[PDB]
Design a protein around this ligand. Structure first.
Ligand SMILES: [Mn+2]
Ligand SMILES: [Mn+2]
Ligand SMILES: [Mn+2]
Ligand SMILES: [Mn+2]
Lengths: 105, 94, 87, 95, 96, 78, 103, 95
DNA sequence: ATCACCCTAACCCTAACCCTAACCCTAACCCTAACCCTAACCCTAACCCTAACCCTAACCCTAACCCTAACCCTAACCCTAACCCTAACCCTAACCCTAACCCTAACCCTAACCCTAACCCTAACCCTAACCCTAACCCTAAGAT
DNA sequence: ATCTTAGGGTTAGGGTTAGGGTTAGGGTTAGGGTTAGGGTTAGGGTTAGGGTTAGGGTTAGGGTTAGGGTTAGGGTTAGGGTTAGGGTTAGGGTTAGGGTTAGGGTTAGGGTTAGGGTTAGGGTTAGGGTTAGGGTTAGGGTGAT
C-alpha cells in the first residue's frame, strides 16, 4: 500500500481529511489516527445514506439518485432524520403524510 | 480560475460498493458533498472543544471517537465507532 | 449606463395560489382568508433576517455580488442549514 | 362538480409527491432584490444565491404549514387560521 | 372555602415571583445517580454537578409548562392535558 | 426514584409556568419528559467525564452537556 | 496597560491571549482584542445597568441572579441575545394569561 | 492547587462605574462571568469562521466588527460597534 | 345500491439533455530526515466526596366535599371550496456589454518569535453591613348576604 | 354593591452570614528587538450578471354558487380542586475515612517542520443512455340518478 487511505482500507481520503483538520483551526496538532478515524466515520455515514437512497431510487423506478431519494432515505430512517433534523435537502420535497383526522368519513 | 475540491470521487466509489447499478445526479452529489462537509465540521469542532476542555494541544482518534459518541444517534454512533476503530487498527498494522 | 426601476409591493408577487400550493405540501386541507396576508408577513420577516446576514457576509468579503455561499452561511447562522448550494 | 375538500385532498397528494418550487421564480427574485436593495444599494445576486434563498423559504414555509395544521387540528379545526401560525411561531421560539 | 381557581391563581403569583427550587434536593439527587448508574457504574457527582442539573431541569420544565398552557388555551381549555405537552414538544422539535 | 418527583412538586412547576388547572395524566407525563431530559443531559455529561478519564462528574461536564443540548446554563463555572 | 491605552476597564491583554490560545486563527490583529474587550465591557455595562435598577426597585443594594433575569427578560434585545440561555436562580417573569384571570 | 481566571475584577469596576452604591452576590457574579465567556466565544468563533470563509489567516477588528453585526441585536449591535470603533481609535491614538 | 365522467397512472416512443466514461495535465499528498515540545510515564500531596448518625417539622398523601369546566349534540350562519374565462406576465431562448470579480506579480509592514521585566490579579484572610428570620401589623380583595 | 373573612405584603426588630475591603507574591503581561510572510498594492483577464429584445401559454385574478365546516347555544357527567389531619422523609447539623483528582518532575517519541517527487483528481471534451414530455391508453374512484 502507498496512500494513507490504502493502509487504513478506506475509500475516503485520509490525506485530505488531515490537511482540512490542520488548515481548519481546530487544534495546534493532529494525531496520526485522527484523520483515519474521521475519514472512516465520514465514509461509513455516506455508505449508510447512499444505501437507503439507492434503495428509494430503485422503488421510484429510477437508475440515478436524485435529491428526492436522499430526502426519502433521510426522513424515513429515525437516526438519519435525527442527525439531519435541522438540515434542508434542496429539491427534496416532503414525506407523503395526510393527517387521518382530515381523511373523509 | 482556481481549483475546487470535492468528495465526488469517493461518494461515487462508496456508491459503487453499495449499489453497483445505481447512479447519482449532479444535485444529489451536491447534497452528498454538503453532507460530508457538515459532519466533518460537526465532528472536528466537537473534538476541537474536547481537546480544549482537557487542556490538550492535539486532536487524536480519542477526541474523534467521543465527538462521534456525542453527535451521532445511538446505533449510527455504535457502528461509526466500530468502523473507525477498525480503520485505525488496520492503519497501525500497515 | 443609466438609472434602474423603483421596486415596490413585491410581497404581492407571492400570490394566493402559490401560498395554497405551499400549504398543500404542508398537508393543509382548508385555508382561512386571513392566512394569505399572514404568510406574506412571516415570509418577509424570514427573508429580511436571511438577506440581512447574507449581505453582511457579502459586505465583509468587500463584494457587491451576494453569492450562494453568503446565503448558505446566513442560513447556517439562522439554524436553517441548507444542502446543495455549496459548503 | 367535486365535493368541498376532494380537489383539496388531491392537491396535497400532488404537491407532497413532488419537489418543484411552488412560488414563481421572477416574482420571488423581485422580492429578494426589493428587500436587499432596501438594506444595501447596488447589490448583485448570483442566479444560485436567489435559488438558495427560494429553496430555504419554501422549505421553511412548508414546515411552518405542517406545525400550523397540527395547531388547527389541536383546536378541533380542519382549516388553518392566523392564531395557528402565531402559536406555531411562538412555540418554535420565533415570536 | 375558596372558589375553584382562586388558590390556584394565588399559587401562580407565589412561585412566579420566587426562584427557589421546587423539586426536593435528595429525591432529585437519587434520580440523577439512578439514571447515571444505567450509563456507567461507580460514578461520583460533584455537589454542584447535581445542582447544575436541577437548575437545568426545573428551568426546562417551567418553560415547557408555559408552552403547554398556551396549547391548552389554544384548544379553548384552561386545564393542561398530555396532548398539550405532546404538541409543545412536537413543535419545539423534541418529538417527531 | 422517578416517583420521588411528586404530584405536588410537579404542580408547583406548572404554577411557575402559569397553569390554572392540571389534568390527572399530566403527572405521569411530566415524569416521562423529565426522565428523557435527564437521560440526554447525564449521558453527554458522563461521556465528558469518561473522556477526562475521571470517575467524578463535574459541574463543567454538566455545563458542557447542556450547551450541546442547546440549554446553556449560567452560573456553574463556564 | 493596553486597556489603559484604549480607555477600557476590560482586559485587552487577556482577550488577546485567549484569542490566539483559543484556536480561532493563525494570527490576531492588534485591534481585534481592543474591539472585543470594548464590546464585552459595553454589554457588561448594559446588563449591570438594568439589573442594578431592578435591584434598586426590590429595596436591595446587592444584585442577585433574580435581578439579572428581570433585566434580561424585560429588555427585548437582551432577551433575544440570551434567548437560549438559563440564568440559574433567575426564576420567571410574572405573567398570568388574561384568559385564566377571574370573572 | 492551580490558578483560576475570572472577569470578576472588571465586572466590579464596570459596576462601580454604572452603580457606585450597588454591589454583587457571589452567584450573580457567577452569571456575569458565564455571560462574558459565552459572548467572547460567540464573537471569537464567528470571527474565526469569517476569516476562514474569506481565505484570510488573521482575525482583525473587521472580523470582530461583522461578527458583532451578525450576533448582536438591532440596537445593541449599533452601540457595541460604536463602543468598539471608539476603543480602537483611542488605542491607535495612544502608543 | 347502479351508471357517468374526471382523474391519475402508465403504456407507447420520440426527444433532448445530463450523466459518466474517456482524455490529460496540474497540484496535492507522500517519503524522508532531523526537529522539539507535548504528553506520556512516575510518585504522592490534599482535596472532597460518600458514608453514617440524629430531630423534629416542613411537607406529602389519602379521602373529606362540591364547583364548574370539558364534551356531546344540535342547529344557527356564512366562510370558503370548486369552477369558469380573460388577459397579464411569467418563462423562455436568445442577444449583448461592461461592471465586477479575481488571478498573480511586486512589495512592505504587521504580526509572531524570543527574553526579562514590572505590575496586575488570585488566593487568602477577617471584619461588618447587607440580608435574613421572625412576629405583629394594615392593606386588599374573597366569598357570601 | 355591603356584609365577615383569610392571607399576603408591610413595618420594625436584631440575628447570622457572606459580601468586598484587605494582605502578599505568584505568574501574567509588557517593551525590548529580530524575523518572515500574509495581505495591500495595481493591474490585466475573463467570467457573468443585468438588461434587452423576442415570442406564446401557462398561470393568474376575479366573481359566482352553495356546500359544509365553524361556533354559538344548552344541557350531561365527572374530574380535578379545596380543605383537613396523619404522618412518612426531607433537611440541615456535624462527624470520619480514603479512593480520587492531580500537582510536578524525568524522559521518550509522536507530531511538525522542511523540499523534492510523483501520483491522484479537477477540469477539460465528448458519445449514448436515462430521463423527459407529448401522444393515447385503460381502469380507477368519484358523485349524481
Ligand atoms: Mn356538518
Ligand atoms: Mn377525582
Ligand atoms: Mn513522525
Ligand atoms: Mn472531475
Amino acid at each position: 500500500a502507498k496512500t494513507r487511505s490504502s493502509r487504513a482500507g478506506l475509500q475516503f481520503p485520509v490525506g485530505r481529511v488531515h490537511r482540512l483538520l490542520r488548515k481548519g483551526n481546530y487544534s495546534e496538532r493532529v494525531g496520526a489516527g485522527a484523520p483515519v478515524y474521521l475519514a472512516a466515520v465520514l465514509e461509513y455515514l455516506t455508505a449508510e445514506i447512499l444505501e437507503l437512497a439507492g434503495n428509494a431510487a430503485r422503488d421510484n423506478k429510477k437508475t440515478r439518485i436524485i435529491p428526492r431519494h436522499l430526502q426519502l432515505a433521510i426522513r424515513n430512517d429515525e437516526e438519519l432524520n435525527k442527525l439531519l433534523g435541522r438540515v434542508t435537502i434542496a429539491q427534496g420535497g416532503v414525506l407523503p403524510n395526510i393527517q387521518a383526522v382530515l381523511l373523509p368519513k | 480560475r482556481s481549483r475546487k475540491e470535492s468528495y465526488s470521487v469517493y461518494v461515487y466509489k462508496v456508491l459503487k460498493q453499495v449499489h453497483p447499478d445505481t447512479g447519482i445526479s449532479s444535485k444529489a452529489m451536491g447534497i452528498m458533498n454538503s453532507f460530508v462537509n457538515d459532519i466533518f465540521e460537526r465532528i472536528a469542532g466537537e473534538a476541537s472543544r474536547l481537546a480544549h476542555y482537557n487542556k490538550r494541544s492535539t486532536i487524536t482518534s480519542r477526541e474523534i471517537q467521543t465527538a462521534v459518541r456525542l453527535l451521532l444517534p445511538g446505533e449510527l454512533a455504535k457502528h461509526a465507532v466500530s468502523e473507525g476503530t477498525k480503520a485505525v487498527t488496520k492503519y497501525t498494522s500497515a | 449606463k443609466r438609472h434602474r426601476k423603483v421596486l415596490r409591493d413585491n410581497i404581492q408577487g407571492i400570490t394566493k395560489p402559490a401560498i395554497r400550493r405551499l400549504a398543500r405540501r404542508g398537508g393543509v386541507k382548508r385555508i382561512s382568508g386571513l392566512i394569505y396576508e399572514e404568510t406574506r408577513g412571516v415570509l418577509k420577516v424570514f427573508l429580511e433576517n436571511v438577506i440581512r446576514d447574507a449581505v453582511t457576509y457579502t459586505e465583509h468579503a468587500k463584494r457587491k455580488t451576494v453569492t450562494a455561499m453568503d446565503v448558505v452561511y446566513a442560513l447556517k447562522r439562522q439554524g436553517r442549514t441548507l444542502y446543495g448550494f455549496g459548503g | 362538480r367535486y365535493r368541498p375538500g376532494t380537489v383539496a385532498l388531491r392537491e396535497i397528494r400532488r404537491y407532497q409527491k413532488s419537489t418543484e418550487l411552488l412560488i414563481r421564480k421572477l416574482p420571488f427574485q423581485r422580492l429578494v432584490r426589493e428587500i436587499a436593495q432596501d438594506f444595501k444599494t447596488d447589490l448583485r445576486f448570483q442566479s444560485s444565491a436567489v435559488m438558495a434563498l427560494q429553496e430555504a423559504c419554501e422549505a421553511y414555509l412548508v414546515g411552518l404549514f405542517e406545525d400550523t395544521n397540527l395547531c388547527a387540528i389541536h383546536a378541533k379545526r380542519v382549516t388553518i387560521m392566523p392564531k395557528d401560525i402565531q402559536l406555531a411561531r411562538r412555540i418554535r421560539g420565533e415570536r
